[PDB]
Amino acid sequence: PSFVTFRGEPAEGFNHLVVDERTGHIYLGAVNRIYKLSSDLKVLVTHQTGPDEDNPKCYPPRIVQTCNEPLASTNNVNKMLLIDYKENRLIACGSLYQGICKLLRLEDLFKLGEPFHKKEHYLSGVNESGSVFGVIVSYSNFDDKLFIATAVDGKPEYFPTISSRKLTKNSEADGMFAYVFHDEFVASMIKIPSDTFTVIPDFDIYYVYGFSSGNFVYFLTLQPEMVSPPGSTTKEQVYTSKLVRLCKEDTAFNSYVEVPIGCERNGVEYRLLQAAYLSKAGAVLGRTLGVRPDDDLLFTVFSKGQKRKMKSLDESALCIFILKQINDRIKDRLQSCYRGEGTLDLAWLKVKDIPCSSALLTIDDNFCGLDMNAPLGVSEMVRGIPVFTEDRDRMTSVIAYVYKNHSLAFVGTKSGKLKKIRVDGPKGNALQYETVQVVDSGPVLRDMAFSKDHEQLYIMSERQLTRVPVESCGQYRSCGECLGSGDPHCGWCVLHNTCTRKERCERSREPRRFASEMKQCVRLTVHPNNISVSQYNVLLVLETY
Amino acid sequence: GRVKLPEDCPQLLRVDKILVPVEVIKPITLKAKNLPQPQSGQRGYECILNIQGIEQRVPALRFNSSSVQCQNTSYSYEGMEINNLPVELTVVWNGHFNIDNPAQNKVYLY
């Protein structure tokens, strides 16, 4: 069988992918292109975002004002892509405009609007794809907004790295991408200080993954050497991967928190986030994990060491974080600051260390942040629970989902292969199967999403999107073989005499209809085991259980 | 996109006379109705001034369905023959598409 795929319609490039929960239509961000595809990966519609005459150096791009520097036709990279269901559209933020964002209609990809005029309308000069992320959160009218983080490239005055912005109903409206609350003193945005730039020239925050949880917004980020590694003057840059969080409700931006994150395997350090995916455990993992049904979990992928964010190392490890545990670390940290102990310790933001002020407070998970002991960092790096480690071929991406309570994890590789891992710390075992639906020579991207029905998993490559089905038990002919393979998806559908998943077996719910363990098979015996050649039409009795 | 009624058509509405001094950098705001949002494969708006001496092509921004503005630029005509020279202006988008100008509003270069 062959896997259904979409070749780079522009054979030329590819960057981001997302699935519409209701339709199953797949939208694909790319350089100079944004595509709308069917569940089957047929081309529904192609939008030309591309090649625009422009220059990165110029501030307000050519349209607003004249630029002395020479222009050249350059490629517009889709930095981000986010589905706005309520608005019935797609926010497809590009670059090469000083980062102007575009709005495409959901069904046809008709350009509803693309605000260029104001400064807020420009997100970032940064040309790199995937270095940006964010979430769209919506409520009924008179309650709403967009949270987005992006790299600056040393543009600190022009753009904020993290911001809370407005998304008006009308795409034509001027108001778009305006800050939720702007005050002369404080605005719902966080800028990088000029002082920090002078000290370390290159400092920049790259945002890999982002998700909304409960009533907060988290970001997995990469930053530069600031007290790590120690160094008197500039020289080499190494990165520290950290977690960021904000209250959805905090216009002030007081809630900002930032903990370094990683995990270690037998004395080997894995500091750099490649990708992450928030998900549910399902009954199996949750129980042994000790969680409530609602509680979330965060699968992640990290490379070894602090070196070369641009081109990381092959050594990579899939770790895990329970949100309850991270929430605890944050609460623990806050309850501490409220003690008045130590400093805030956030190097890039505050050069001069300000002390934490003690105060009487009931420290809860609900705590949104206060005026004093304002944005703060974290001392203790939060360690994660390791799961699978690949030395030979680096993991690029990850996804996970709940199936019949068993938790299946998906992991992209540098090779263009997907691993189907049942996580069984809470259960007991490891990796079930590996597949090369994708692209035999070269890698898979972080945007890897399961379909709404959860039948398939769209796997994106630089070149192509591939619809990889989540099991291929049919290959197994007999109950003995089916249960023999062990890849957890497979069971013996007794009456059908075929090997497939629980969902696939009709009436599997009923007793002895479906066999999970070899014992359940099938066992057969014949009373006259031996019959002579000379004999004919002998009566035989068969015992089957 | 459909236009059933004549009132709804894409056209430029008039404002107080557009006065333009020669050799001065000035923006020219315009008002209009039912300006289309350019669709895929379609470029943005430009202001074209038909001056016999020199025809100027200045790109513009369509803020909404009813307002436009040519970017900061200066205009001139050679001759110093006459103080007030009215000039026909054509608003175009996607290169060739000229928006209708019923009033046939002009720019006065003085």
Residues closing a segment before a gap in chain B (C–N exceeding 2.5 Å): none
Q: How many helices (H) and strands (E) does chain B have?
A: 0, 9
Mutation for testing the B interface, residue in A111, A118, A122, A171 having most B CBs under 10 Å: A111
Place of tokens 């069904």: A107
Using a CB-CB cut-off of 8 Å, the residues of chain B touching A61 are none
Nearest to B41 among A48, A64, A66 (CB): A48
Rounded CA-CA distance A318/A299 in Å is 7
| Strand (E) or helix (H) holding A197 | helix A194-199
Q: What is the DSSP string of A311-341?
A: S--S-EEEEEEEHHHHHHHHHHHHHHHTTT-
Task: State the pairing for strand pair A26-30/A16-19.
Answer: antiparallel
User: Pick from A404, A410, A417: which is nearest to A388 by CA?
Assistant: A410
Query: What resolution in angstroms, rounded to 1 decimal?
Result: 7.5
Cβ neighbors of A372 (< 8 A, separation 6 or more) are: A357, A359
Residues B72, A165, A176: CA angle, nearest 5 degrees:
40
Residues A466, A471, A476: CA angle, nearest 5 degrees:
130
The DSSP output letter for B42 is -
Residue A467 pairs in a beta bridge with A4, A458
Experimental method: X-ray
How close A47 gets to chain B, by Cα (Å)? 6
Rounded CA-CA distance A130/A136 in Å is 17
Neighbours of A253 (CB within 10 A): 22
| Residue A40 in tokens | 């089957």
- Give the 3-state secondary structure of residue B32: strand
Q: Do B38 and A111 touch (CB under 8 A)?
A: yes
Q: Are the CB atoms for A297 and A281 separated by under 8 Å?
A: yes
Ramachandran quadrant class, A129 (left: phi over 0; alpha: psi -120 to 50; beta: rest): beta
Q: Are the CB atoms for A473 and A499 separated by under 8 Å?
A: yes
Q: Are the CB atoms for A242 and A228 separated by under 8 Å?
A: no
How close A63 gets to chain B, by Cα (Å)? 7
Closest-approach residue (CA) in chain A for B41 = A48
The DSSP output letter for A343 is B
Q: What secondary structure, in 3-state letters, does A493-536 show?
A: ECCCCEEECCCCCCCCCCCCCEECCHHHCCCEEECCCCCCCCCC
Closest-approach residue (CA) in chain B for A33 = B40
Q: Do B72 and A65 touch (CB under 8 A)?
A: yes
User: Pick from A357, A190, A192, A183: which is nearest to A257 by CA?
Assistant: A190
Q: Are the CB atoms for B34 and B13 separated by under 8 Å?
A: no
Q: What are phi and psi of A480, to 5 degrees?
A: -65, -40
| Residue A273 in tokens | 């986030």
Q: Are the CB atoms for A466 and A458 separated by under 8 Å?
A: yes
Would you list which residues of chain A are within 8 Å, Cβ to Cβ, of chain B? 47-48, 63-66, 109-113, 116-117, 172-174
How close B9 gets to chain A, by Cα (Å)? 19
* Cα dihedral B62→B67→B71→B77 (10° resolution): 120
Residue type, A69: E
| Residue A291 in tokens | 């969680």
Rounded CA-CA distance A12/A9 in Å is 8
Q: Which long-range contacts (CB under 8 A, 24 or more apart) does B67-71 make?
A: B67/B29, B67/B30, B67/B31, B67/B32, B68/B12, B68/B29, B68/B30, B68/B31, B68/B32, B68/B35, B69/B27, B69/B28, B69/B29, B69/B30, B70/B27, B70/B28, B70/B30, B71/A63, B71/A64, B71/A65, B71/A66, B71/B27
Cα distances from A3 to residues A386, A458, A470, in angstroms, run: 31, 11, 12
Q: Which long-range contacts (CB under 8 A, 24 or more apart) does A450-458 make?
A: A450/A19, A450/A399, A450/A401, A450/A410, A451/A19, A451/A24, A451/A39, A452/A19, A452/A20, A452/A21, A452/A22, A452/A23, A452/A24, A453/A24, A454/A401, A454/A403, A456/A39, A457/A399, A457/A410, A457/A418, A458/A17, A458/A19, A458/A26, A458/A41
How close B8 gets to chain A, by Cα (Å)? 18
Cα distances from B1 to residues A174, B4, B38, in angstroms, run: 22, 10, 11
Classify the C-alpha dihedral A30-A271-A363-A322 as positive or negative.
positive
- Give the 3-state secondary structure of residue A78: coil
The Cβ-side half-sphere exposure at A229, using a 13 Å CA radius, reads 8
User: Pick from A226, A188, A179, A219: which is nearest to A204 by CA?
Assistant: A226
Beta strands in chain B (DSSP E): 11-13, 18-20, 26-33, 45-50, 56-64, 67-73, 85-93, 97-98, 106-109
Q: Are the CB atoms for A220 and A208 separated by under 8 Å?
A: yes
Rounded CA-CA distance B78/B53 in Å is 6
Q: Are the CB atoms for A111 and A101 separated by under 8 Å?
A: no
| Residue A441 in tokens | 């020579």
Q: Are the CB atoms for A37 and A26 separated by under 8 Å?
A: yes
Using a CB-CB cut-off of 8 Å, the residues of chain A touching B65 are 172
How close A34 gets to chain B, by Cα (Å)? 11
Q: Are the CB atoms for A396 and A442 separated by under 8 Å?
A: no
Q: Are the CB atoms for A37 and A44 separated by under 8 Å?
A: yes
The DSSP output letter for A33 is E
Place of tokens 């609350």: A181
Q: Are the CB atoms for A65 and A22 separated by under 8 Å?
A: no
Q: Do B38 and A109 touch (CB under 8 A)?
A: no
Cβ neighbors of B65 (< 8 A, separation 6 or more) are: A172, B33, B34, B35
Question: Could you tell me how many residues make up chain B?
Answer: 110
Q: Are the CB atoms for A447 and A453 separated by under 8 Å?
A: no
The radius of gyration computed from the CA coordinates of chain A, to the nearest angstrom, equals 27
Strand order in the sheet with A385-390: A272-279, A297-303, A316-322, A385-390
Q: Are the CB atoms for A167 and A108 separated by under 8 Å?
A: no
Residue B22 pairs in a beta bridge with B75
Rounded CA-CA distance B40/A90 in Å is 15
Residue type, A39: S
Q: Do B37 and A113 touch (CB under 8 A)?
A: yes
Q: Do B40 and A117 touch (CB under 8 A)?
A: no
Using a CB-CB cut-off of 8 Å, the residues of chain A touching B40 are 47-48, 109-111
Q: What are phi and psi of A197, to 5 degrees?
A: -65, -45
Q: Are the CB atoms for A440 and A461 separated by under 8 Å?
A: no
Question: Could you tell me how many residues make up chain A?
Answer: 545
Mutation for testing the A interface, residue in B33, B37, B62 having most A CBs under 10 Å: B37
Q: What is the DSSP string of A251-317?
A: TT-TT-EEEEEEEEETTEEE-EEEEEEEE--HHHHHHHHT--TT--EEEEEEESBS--SSS--S-EE
